[PDB]
Amino acid sequence: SFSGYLKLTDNVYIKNADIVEEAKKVKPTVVVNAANVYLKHGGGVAGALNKATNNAMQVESDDYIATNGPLKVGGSCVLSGHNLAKHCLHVVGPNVNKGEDIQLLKSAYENFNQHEVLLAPLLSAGIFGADPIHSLRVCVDTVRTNVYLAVFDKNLYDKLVSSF
Ligand SMILES: C[C@@H](Nc1ncnc2[nH]ccc12)[C@@H]1CCOC1
Helix, strand or coil, rough: CCCCCCCCCCCEEECCCCHHHHHHHEEEEEEEEECCCCCCCCCHHHHHHHHCCCCCHHHHHHHHHHHCCCCCCCCCCEEEEECCCCCEEEEECCCCCCCCCCCCHHHHHHHHHHEEEEEEEECHHHHHHHHHHHHHHHHHHHCEEEEEECCCHHHHHHHHHHEE
């Protein structure tokens, strides 16, 4: 049901799109959230996905943290996808603006290998402060399952494709 994606490799595809609008159209099995360790969905992809769930994602996430404590940087958890997907895979990439080790980006992408197909953003890019060209290269060299990347910024999408 994914449409309009450019094929980059055997298993990685990319499109200039808002991941929230893509999830509402496709209703995939798994949508990836660019989470932080506390699952506090304030801005970027996380704030946008949470708003589309009418804050149900944040209520579920607060119950998960009250029970389990915070995630690790590089880690993940599977929660409901609410009205957007069957499941949401909350993945924590390193936030370079907070001094987190960029080597953890490969560990973050390894979480995608537990799922046959995913709709996802570029981890650690945008407000997380890492170089998006590096994030796409780590994605391609780490993920083996089928990943559909939605990149919101038009200008960054064009740069990612033309430098691939
Ligand atoms: C990390 C990434 N943020 C998003 N990529 C996809 N869907 C999104 N929806 C809300 C944010 C968002 C970068 C910021 C703009 O494009 C690249």
